[PDB]
Amino acid sequence: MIVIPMAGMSSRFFKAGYTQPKYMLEAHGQTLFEHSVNSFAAYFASTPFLFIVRNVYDTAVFVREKATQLGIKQFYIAELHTETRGQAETVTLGLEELAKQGVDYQGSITVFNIDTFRPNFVFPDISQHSDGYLEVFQGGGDNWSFAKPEHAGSTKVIQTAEKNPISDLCSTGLYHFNRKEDYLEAYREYVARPSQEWERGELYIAPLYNELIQKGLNIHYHLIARHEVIFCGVPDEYTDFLRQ
Ligand SMILES: [Mg+2]
């Protein structure tokens, strides 16, 4: 199941002068929402999608209309009524809402964000031989979530960090978990950490893998090329995408 947490707020875009939430902005004939979800076009007929939105800007209606139009055959919308502390909480609340709708899903979940485009995405082979994996690229700077490799020739991940550059393998924002239950258990452990371990209040997805790795689960990374991912999460990137 492809899960897209999109309950956040477009604050940088608001300041930049846009009055619509970022995912409704248009570029080259379609909304950023469409550009991002189309990454998974190969799975529209076979895989369920869970869109987790907020009760603002009539987003639930927008998503339902766009998803139907894209031809996504099975999708669910979880509408949240309060802001969350971050994507990890959004995902957890969305999965809880899905269950409240009567849907009993126990399979894998692939978390992705609406700020990223991954044209022609196809699941890598490692997704069939691991408990979870983080898609990564060779990135510049320190403002990414990082995955630390065990050693050359192995795609095993021994640690992840959201702001600490423990490696040069940066997350593309695609986080896969073979079992929904493992995601929820890692989340539960993460929010229950003794207070001394908290460095911030935001709840991001990447750190959750440390809970799984500690429990001995088999977590890997999958390296993609820089040209296979397009980021459109800040105003300047949207402007750049508009020129492309
Ligand atoms: Mg712990």
Q: Give the resolution value in Å.
A: 1.9
Centre of ligand 1 from the C-alpha of residue 191, in Å: 10
Centre of ligand 1 from the C-alpha of residue 173, in Å: 23
Residue 170, amino acid: C
Centre of ligand 1 from the C-alpha of residue 114, in Å: 30
How many angstroms from the chain centroid is the CA of residue 88?
A: 9
CA distance 127 to 176: 8
- Please report the sign of the dihedral spanned by the C-alpha atoms of residue 55, residue 61, residue 65, residue 71: positive
SS3 labels along the chain: CEEEEECCCCHHHHHCCCCCCHHHCEECCEEHHHHHHHHHHHHCCCCCEEEEEECCCCHHHHHHHHHHHHCCCCEEEEEECCCCCCHHHHHHHHHHHHHHCCCCCCCCEEECCCCEECCCCCCCHHHHCCCEEEEEEECCCCCCCEEEECCCCCCEEEEEECCCCCCCEEEEEEEEECCHHHHHHHHHHHHCCCHHHCCCCCCCCCCHHHHHHHCCCCEEEEECCHHHCEECCCHHHHHHHHHC
Structural domains of the chain, ranges and CATH numbers in brackets: 2-244 (3.90.550.10)
Centre of ligand 1 from the C-alpha of residue 215, in Å: 10
**β-strand 49-54 against 157-161: which pairing, if any?**
unpaired
**β-strand 169-177 against 132-138: which pairing, if any?**
antiparallel
Structure-determination technique: X-ray
Is residue 123 within 8 A of residue 220, CB to CB? The reply is no
